[PDB]
Design a protein around this ligand. Structure first.
Ligand SMILES: [K+]
Ligand SMILES: [K+]
Ligand SMILES: [Mg+2]
Ligand SMILES: [Mg+2]
Ligand SMILES: [Mg+2]
Ligand SMILES: [Mg+2]
Ligand SMILES: [Mg+2]
Ligand SMILES: [Mg+2]
Ligand SMILES: [Mg+2]
Ligand SMILES: [Mg+2]
Ligand SMILES: [Mg+2]
Ligand SMILES: [Mg+2]
Ligand SMILES: [Mg+2]
Ligand SMILES: [Mg+2]
Ligand SMILES: [Mg+2]
Ligand SMILES: [Mg+2]
Ligand SMILES: [Mg+2]
Ligand SMILES: [Mg+2]
Ligand SMILES: [Mg+2]
Ligand SMILES: [Mg+2]
Ligand SMILES: [Mg+2]
Ligand SMILES: [Mg+2]
Ligand SMILES: [Mg+2]
Ligand SMILES: [Mg+2]
Ligand SMILES: [Mg+2]
Ligand SMILES: [Mg+2]
Ligand SMILES: [Mg+2]
Ligand SMILES: [Mg+2]
Ligand SMILES: [Mg+2]
Ligand SMILES: [Mg+2]
Ligand SMILES: [Mg+2]
Ligand SMILES: [Mg+2]
Ligand SMILES: [Mg+2]
Ligand SMILES: [Mg+2]
Ligand SMILES: [Mg+2]
Ligand SMILES: [Mg+2]
Ligand SMILES: [Mg+2]
Ligand SMILES: [Mg+2]
Ligand SMILES: [Mg+2]
Ligand SMILES: [Mg+2]
Ligand SMILES: [Mg+2]
Ligand SMILES: [Mg+2]
Ligand SMILES: [Mg+2]
Ligand SMILES: [Mg+2]
Ligand SMILES: [Mg+2]
Ligand SMILES: [Mg+2]
Ligand SMILES: [Mg+2]
Ligand SMILES: [Mg+2]
Ligand SMILES: [Mg+2]
Ligand SMILES: [Mg+2]
Ligand SMILES: [Mg+2]
Ligand SMILES: [Mg+2]
Ligand SMILES: [Mg+2]
Ligand SMILES: [Mg+2]
Ligand SMILES: [Mg+2]
Ligand SMILES: [Mg+2]
Ligand SMILES: [Mg+2]
Ligand SMILES: [Mg+2]
Ligand SMILES: [Mg+2]
Ligand SMILES: [Mg+2]
Ligand SMILES: [Mg+2]
Ligand SMILES: [Mg+2]
Ligand SMILES: [Mg+2]
Ligand SMILES: [Mg+2]
Ligand SMILES: [Mg+2]
Ligand SMILES: [Mg+2]
Ligand SMILES: [Mg+2]
Ligand SMILES: [Mg+2]
Ligand SMILES: [Mg+2]
Ligand SMILES: [Mg+2]
Ligand SMILES: [Mg+2]
Ligand SMILES: [Mg+2]
Ligand SMILES: [Mg+2]
Ligand SMILES: [Mg+2]
Ligand SMILES: [Mg+2]
Ligand SMILES: [Mg+2]
Ligand SMILES: [Mg+2]
Ligand SMILES: [Mg+2]
Ligand SMILES: [Mg+2]
Ligand SMILES: [Mg+2]
Ligand SMILES: [Mg+2]
Ligand SMILES: [Mg+2]
Ligand SMILES: [Mg+2]
Ligand SMILES: [Mg+2]
Ligand SMILES: [Mg+2]
Ligand SMILES: [Mg+2]
Ligand SMILES: [Mg+2]
Ligand SMILES: [Mg+2]
Ligand SMILES: [Mg+2]
Ligand SMILES: [Mg+2]
Ligand SMILES: [Mg+2]
Ligand SMILES: [Mg+2]
Ligand SMILES: [Mg+2]
Ligand SMILES: [Mg+2]
Ligand SMILES: [Mg+2]
Ligand SMILES: [Mg+2]
Ligand SMILES: [Mg+2]
Ligand SMILES: [Mg+2]
Ligand SMILES: [Mg+2]
Ligand SMILES: [Mg+2]
Ligand SMILES: [Mg+2]
Ligand SMILES: [Mg+2]
Ligand SMILES: [Mg+2]
Ligand SMILES: [Mg+2]
Ligand SMILES: [Mg+2]
Ligand SMILES: [Mg+2]
Ligand SMILES: [Mg+2]
Ligand SMILES: [Mg+2]
Ligand SMILES: [Mg+2]
Ligand SMILES: [Mg+2]
Ligand SMILES: [Mg+2]
Ligand SMILES: [Mg+2]
Ligand SMILES: [Mg+2]
Ligand SMILES: [Mg+2]
Ligand SMILES: [Mg+2]
Ligand SMILES: [Mg+2]
Ligand SMILES: [Mg+2]
Ligand SMILES: [Mg+2]
Ligand SMILES: [Mg+2]
Ligand SMILES: [Mg+2]
Ligand SMILES: [Mg+2]
Ligand SMILES: [Mg+2]
Ligand SMILES: [Mg+2]
Ligand SMILES: [Mg+2]
Ligand SMILES: [Mg+2]
Ligand SMILES: [Mg+2]
Ligand SMILES: [Mg+2]
Ligand SMILES: [Mg+2]
Ligand SMILES: [Mg+2]
Ligand SMILES: [Mg+2]
Ligand SMILES: [Mg+2]
Ligand SMILES: [Mg+2]
Ligand SMILES: [Mg+2]
Ligand SMILES: [Mg+2]
Ligand SMILES: [Mg+2]
Ligand SMILES: [Mg+2]
Ligand SMILES: [Mg+2]
Ligand SMILES: [Mg+2]
Ligand SMILES: [Mg+2]
Ligand SMILES: [Mg+2]
Ligand SMILES: [Mg+2]
Ligand SMILES: [Mg+2]
Ligand SMILES: [Mg+2]
Ligand SMILES: [Mg+2]
Ligand SMILES: [Mg+2]
Ligand SMILES: [Mg+2]
Ligand SMILES: [Mg+2]
Ligand SMILES: [Mg+2]
Ligand SMILES: [Mg+2]
Ligand SMILES: [Mg+2]
Ligand SMILES: [Mg+2]
Ligand SMILES: [Mg+2]
Ligand SMILES: [Mg+2]
Ligand SMILES: [Mg+2]
Ligand SMILES: [Mg+2]
Ligand SMILES: [Mg+2]
Ligand SMILES: [Mg+2]
Ligand SMILES: [Mg+2]
Ligand SMILES: [Mg+2]
Ligand SMILES: [Mg+2]
Ligand SMILES: [Mg+2]
Ligand SMILES: [Mg+2]
Ligand SMILES: [Mg+2]
Ligand SMILES: [Mg+2]
Ligand SMILES: [Mg+2]
Ligand SMILES: [Mg+2]
Ligand SMILES: [Mg+2]
Ligand SMILES: [Mg+2]
Ligand SMILES: [Mg+2]
Ligand SMILES: [Mg+2]
Ligand SMILES: [Mg+2]
Ligand SMILES: [Mg+2]
Ligand SMILES: [Mg+2]
Ligand SMILES: [Mg+2]
Ligand SMILES: [Mg+2]
Ligand SMILES: [Mg+2]
Lengths: 64, 200, 115, 143
RNA sequence: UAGCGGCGAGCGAACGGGGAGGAGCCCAGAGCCUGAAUCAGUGUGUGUGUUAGUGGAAGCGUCUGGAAAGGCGCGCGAUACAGGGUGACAGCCCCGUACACAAAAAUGCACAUGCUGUGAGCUCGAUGAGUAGGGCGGGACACGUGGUAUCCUGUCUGAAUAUGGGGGGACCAUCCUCCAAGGCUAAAUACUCCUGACUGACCGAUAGUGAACCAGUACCGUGAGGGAAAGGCGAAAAGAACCCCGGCGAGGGGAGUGAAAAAGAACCUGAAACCGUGUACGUACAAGCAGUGGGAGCAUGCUUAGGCGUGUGACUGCGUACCUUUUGUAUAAUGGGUCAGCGACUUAUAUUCUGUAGCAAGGUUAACCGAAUAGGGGAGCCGAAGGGAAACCGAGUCUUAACU
């Protein structure tokens, strides 16, 4: 049978041109008023997955 | 060109299709794949599941001095098991059109270099009789041959069944293993023309 | 393609049991026991190629040390006597000479007495 | 060449790992899978994205976005693969019969992929600013 | 993939496209006219299968040998060299085979077809009510009540019925499309107790069925049920008349048969553990993984006037099995009485990487038809473009009012 993609992983990562994956930063859902705006600003844009935890992502979604 | 043995006519052929370097790996792959495609692969053993018997424990886990057993059907036990039982399976491995054509083009060109390929004009026996075909191959110094023909004639095809060293394929139905197998290939001028257009 | 393995196994066991020929009891008869014996034999054999070169040196030294003390010099002073006279002759031969040609050997002890 | 004299290219075939076949084999007794633990066990090994019970990366991170229904049915026509249809008319249905874009694609776009020669009148397709310069430089009109 | 999902584990479409295969109808009924299409009894000649079968080509001499089919020499058939048997391996000895044939009788199909027995075409109409829908509770849909369409119904209700109604994924309005609440229908599709032929990089007696053998047997269990072991003399029984020892025994030795009787029915080959008998050497003051270095003697085959090669091994240096598991094992931790046989990284499909081969801005086909692994088939897939949540823009683009 075909490999099933880990769907939850498909909904949190997106494949970039070179091969890596963009993902949204954690700590930006609730409890925002106590956070400084400089954090919240820096957490807003999408960010790349580190080389340590890349193999875990590549495994759980083999298609794209 | 392909010189004939009863005419000496300059039969012009494509320099590619009948004049390439011998790509050995390609030909080996195509002939191995062809030979694989011949396998029917009809077999099975029976796993510990499929063997007849019960799922009873022969003896209880403890207390007995025996080595803890769980089934009479286990592969380490005699009579019933075979750990990785076989199953019927399609061995027919895939071969790229271009690789197959390229391999034929290759092996069909080495018959010119090695002088196995005896290209001829009209090749047909009188009546459906092996006796005649046998007598006419004696003139040509041929014994083991693959007589490839354009118009497949009953007179010829029916006079080469019983001859083990003579096979009569149609120009459409040439094969990688067959061209290599037979000591000579007696090809008809029409068959060369068909094979030329087929391989391209 | 099922592979029976009785022809090969037998040949493999029979090979080792041929190397264990001469050993006591099960060590010659019984593959499972022989195979250990044949390995340990090889281990000891490998070891004792090293020990052979040690034992013989001792043996020779003890012959030379005996043969020199009959002439009145100890092995320790004798070898220094030979080395200070730049004599290149080894223990193997000195020990051979000591036994066979004592009248010759005596000359080396004089040659050593010079130094 | 004979049926026997054939041989493969050097490097093509590589035998294959055969575990549990003596000392000399190298791998043999614990078929290259160490001593004990879940990974040594037959049918062992943890599932994908399992970090020992720590909350996995694909769950500690937040989920974002929505999949567009429209993007599925739009195409990105490379300018090089444009003069391969019917002289110089590329509506959409003509471009589809050339097998350049899929059947269920109603919107399409011609981007600056490079290389045009013949004059192509592009009618209906949305055209890029870089491609509009090229297509017109070659001679072709738009709309 | 879109979705679903303690948005976890996992579950997972549809539209659309390519193929196989194709076919449609009948009632809720009046008309002029009607046996016409149709499927319907059954006969009925037919075809051409099935159940018995018939014919079916061409070899000879020498050489080993128990025996020739084998070696060598000369031939001959071949629409037949598939295969099996015959005293060893047979195109021509036999049985078959290709091929040509064959039914008194019983049947399976495929066209005429007399017909108990059956209606087209018309006009006109009608066009499925406790039903659709709803509330309540459940289940089915990829879809877990979720914004949840659609389907089914236990329960309580309840329309309009063709200017009518259902559906287009909450819902509404326009557009579009269909006609529910009555039915029927071959093919492509699934399967093989069983029958016939043929085929295997399937097994060859611990394998292959549990079962090559009188096996679902012996045997075990109150019973349901479980469930073995066990193949082979030789070409031919020519299966050992007779004589001898013994109890008219078993068993043996002769004789005879045979190529062979260490092929004598406990029968091809006949391994190992294990047990003997005979030789050579060692061994009754010597301590221990039993060997290994060194090494005398004795016994030996050879040669030769050389020494070796073996067998043994007095004395002597060193030396605590193997596997496992462990920081670490002679360990008094595990496992093994021995031998022989079997006994554990496979398979399929996806995916990524490496080698390799093809072709390269291209590469490649799937099911499918075809009959021969070719050739079609490019439906599709992957690549040549990315950024953005997305619209969208695009060698850029997102960010932001804009960004050096
Ligand atoms: K025997
Ligand atoms: K000791
Ligand atoms: Mg990319
Ligand atoms: Mg920072
Ligand atoms: Mg994909
Ligand atoms: Mg090569
Ligand atoms: Mg079962
Ligand atoms: Mg039970
Ligand atoms: Mg015990
Ligand atoms: Mg079995
Ligand atoms: Mg494979
Ligand atoms: Mg076999
Ligand atoms: Mg073997
Ligand atoms: Mg000894
Ligand atoms: Mg022995
Ligand atoms: Mg030393
Ligand atoms: Mg040293
Ligand atoms: Mg010195
Ligand atoms: Mg290599
Ligand atoms: Mg393999
Ligand atoms: Mg290795
Ligand atoms: Mg290792
Ligand atoms: Mg290796
Ligand atoms: Mg081991
Ligand atoms: Mg272990
Ligand atoms: Mg453990
Ligand atoms: Mg481990
Ligand atoms: Mg399991
Ligand atoms: Mg398991
Ligand atoms: Mg695993
Ligand atoms: Mg297409
Ligand atoms: Mg621009
Ligand atoms: Mg939770
Ligand atoms: Mg399911
Ligand atoms: Mg599943
Ligand atoms: Mg369409
Ligand atoms: Mg089509
Ligand atoms: Mg379709
Ligand atoms: Mg079709
Ligand atoms: Mg068909
Ligand atoms: Mg059809
Ligand atoms: Mg069709
Ligand atoms: Mg039809
Ligand atoms: Mg119609
Ligand atoms: Mg109809
Ligand atoms: Mg009604
Ligand atoms: Mg007939
Ligand atoms: Mg007959
Ligand atoms: Mg005959
Ligand atoms: Mg004679
Ligand atoms: Mg005679
Ligand atoms: Mg003679
Ligand atoms: Mg004779
Ligand atoms: Mg005789
Ligand atoms: Mg004869
Ligand atoms: Mg001979
Ligand atoms: Mg002749
Ligand atoms: Mg023959
Ligand atoms: Mg014989
Ligand atoms: Mg022969
Ligand atoms: Mg003959
Ligand atoms: Mg035969
Ligand atoms: Mg012959
Ligand atoms: Mg016929
Ligand atoms: Mg009849
Ligand atoms: Mg008759
Ligand atoms: Mg009849
Ligand atoms: Mg109706
Ligand atoms: Mg009604
Ligand atoms: Mg409804
Ligand atoms: Mg309802
Ligand atoms: Mg509604
Ligand atoms: Mg509804
Ligand atoms: Mg409702
Ligand atoms: Mg209510
Ligand atoms: Mg409700
Ligand atoms: Mg409801
Ligand atoms: Mg519910
Ligand atoms: Mg459900
Ligand atoms: Mg939701
Ligand atoms: Mg909501
Ligand atoms: Mg609705
Ligand atoms: Mg109506
Ligand atoms: Mg109307
Ligand atoms: Mg109307
Ligand atoms: Mg209305
Ligand atoms: Mg309406
Ligand atoms: Mg609809
Ligand atoms: Mg609907
Ligand atoms: Mg509506
Ligand atoms: Mg809608
Ligand atoms: Mg929807
Ligand atoms: Mg829909
Ligand atoms: Mg409306
Ligand atoms: Mg209706
Ligand atoms: Mg109507
Ligand atoms: Mg309804
Ligand atoms: Mg209906
Ligand atoms: Mg209903
Ligand atoms: Mg109903
Ligand atoms: Mg209906
Ligand atoms: Mg019917
Ligand atoms: Mg039918
Ligand atoms: Mg066949
Ligand atoms: Mg075969
Ligand atoms: Mg087989
Ligand atoms: Mg066999
Ligand atoms: Mg058996
Ligand atoms: Mg046997
Ligand atoms: Mg047996
Ligand atoms: Mg059984
Ligand atoms: Mg009983
Ligand atoms: Mg037997
Ligand atoms: Mg018999
Ligand atoms: Mg026999
Ligand atoms: Mg007798
Ligand atoms: Mg008497
Ligand atoms: Mg008597
Ligand atoms: Mg008596
Ligand atoms: Mg008596
Ligand atoms: Mg008597
Ligand atoms: Mg008597
Ligand atoms: Mg007797
Ligand atoms: Mg006798
Ligand atoms: Mg006799
Ligand atoms: Mg005789
Ligand atoms: Mg004999
Ligand atoms: Mg006897
Ligand atoms: Mg005799
Ligand atoms: Mg014998
Ligand atoms: Mg008897
Ligand atoms: Mg016996
Ligand atoms: Mg016996
Ligand atoms: Mg027997
Ligand atoms: Mg025999
Ligand atoms: Mg026997
Ligand atoms: Mg015996
Ligand atoms: Mg023995
Ligand atoms: Mg003696
Ligand atoms: Mg003695
Ligand atoms: Mg003695
Ligand atoms: Mg003594
Ligand atoms: Mg003594
Ligand atoms: Mg003792
Ligand atoms: Mg001691
Ligand atoms: Mg000792
Ligand atoms: Mg002596
Ligand atoms: Mg002597
Ligand atoms: Mg010796
Ligand atoms: Mg020690
Ligand atoms: Mg010691
Ligand atoms: Mg352990
Ligand atoms: Mg360990
Ligand atoms: Mg342990
Ligand atoms: Mg411990
Ligand atoms: Mg111990
Ligand atoms: Mg220790
Ligand atoms: Mg112990
Ligand atoms: Mg202790
Ligand atoms: Mg102890
Ligand atoms: Mg213990
Ligand atoms: Mg333990
Ligand atoms: Mg152990
Ligand atoms: Mg024990
Ligand atoms: Mg594996
Ligand atoms: Mg792939
Ligand atoms: Mg790559
Ligand atoms: Mg290139
Ligand atoms: Mg192409
Ligand atoms: Mg088919
Ligand atoms: Mg088509
Ligand atoms: Mg085409
Ligand atoms: Mg096409
Ligand atoms: Mg790529
Ligand atoms: Mg921009
Ligand atoms: Mg801007």
């Amino acid at each position: 049978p075909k490999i099933k993609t880990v769907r939850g992983a498909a909904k949190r990562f997106k494949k970039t041109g070179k091969g890596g994956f963009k993902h949204k930063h954690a700590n930006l859902r609730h409890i925002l008023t106590k956070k400084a705006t400089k954090r919240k600003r820096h957490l807003r844009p999408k960010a790349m997955v580190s080389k340590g935890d890349l193999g875990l992502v590549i495994a759980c979604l083999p298609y794209a | 060109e392909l010189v004939l043995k009863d005419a000496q006519s300059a039969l012009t052929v494509s320099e590619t299709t009948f004049g390439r370097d011998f790509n050995e790996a390609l030909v080996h792959q195509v002939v191995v794949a062809y030979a694989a495609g011949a396998r029917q692969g009809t077999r099975a053993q029976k796993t510990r599941a499929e063997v007849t018997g019960s799922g009873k424990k022969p003896w209880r886990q403890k207390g007995t001095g025996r080595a803890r057993s769980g089934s009479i059907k286990s592969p380490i036990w005699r009579s019933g098991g075979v750990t990785f039982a076989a199953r019927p399976q399609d061995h027919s491995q895939k071969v790229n059109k271009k690789m197959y054509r390229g391999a034929l083009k290759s092996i069909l060109s080495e018959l010119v270099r090695q002088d196995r390929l005896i290209v001829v004009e009209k090749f047909s026996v009188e009546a459906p009789k092996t006796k005649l075909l046998a007598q006419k191959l004696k003139d040509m110094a041929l014994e083991d041959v693959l007589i490839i023909t354009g118009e497949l004639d009953e007179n010829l095809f029916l006079a080469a069944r019983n001859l083990h060293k003579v096979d009569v394929r149609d120009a459409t139905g040439i094969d990688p293993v067959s061209l290599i197998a037979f000591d000579k290939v007696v090809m008809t001028a029409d068959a060369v023309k068909q094979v030329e257009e087929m391989l391209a | 393609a099922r592979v029976k393995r009785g022809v090969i196994a037998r040949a493999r066991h029979k090979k080792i049991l041929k190397q264990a020929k001469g050993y006591y009891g099960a060590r010659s008869r019984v593959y499972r026991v022989a195979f250990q014996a044949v390995i340990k034999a090889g281990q000891y054999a490998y070891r004792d190629r090293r020990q052979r070169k040690r034992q013989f040196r001792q043996l020779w030294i003890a012959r030379i040390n005996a043969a020199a003390r009959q002439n009145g010099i100890s092995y320790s002073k004798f070898i220094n006597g030979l080395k200070k006279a730049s004599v290149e002759i080894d223990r193997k031969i000195l020990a051979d000479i000591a036994v066979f040609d004592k009248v010759a050997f005596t000359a080396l002890v004089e040659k050593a007495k010079a130094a | 060449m004979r049926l026997n004299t054939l041989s493969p290219a050097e490097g093509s075939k590589k035998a294959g790992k055969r575990l549990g076949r003596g000392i000399g084999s190298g791998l043999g007794k614990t078929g290259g899978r160490g001593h004990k633990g879940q990974k040594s066990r037959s049918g062992g090994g943890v599932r994908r994205g399992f970090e020992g019970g720590q909350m996995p990366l694909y769950r500690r991170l937040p989920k974002f976005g929505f999949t567009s229904r429209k993007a599925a049915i739009t195409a990105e026509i490379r300018l090089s693969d444009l003069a391969k249809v019917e002289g110089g008319v590329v509506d959409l249905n003509t471009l589809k019969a050339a097998n350049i874009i899929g059947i269920q694609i109603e919107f399409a776009k011609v981007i600056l992929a490079g290389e045009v020669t013949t004059p192509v009148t592009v009618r209906g397709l949305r055209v890029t600013k870089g491609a509009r310069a090229a297509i017109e430089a070659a001679g072709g009109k738009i709309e």
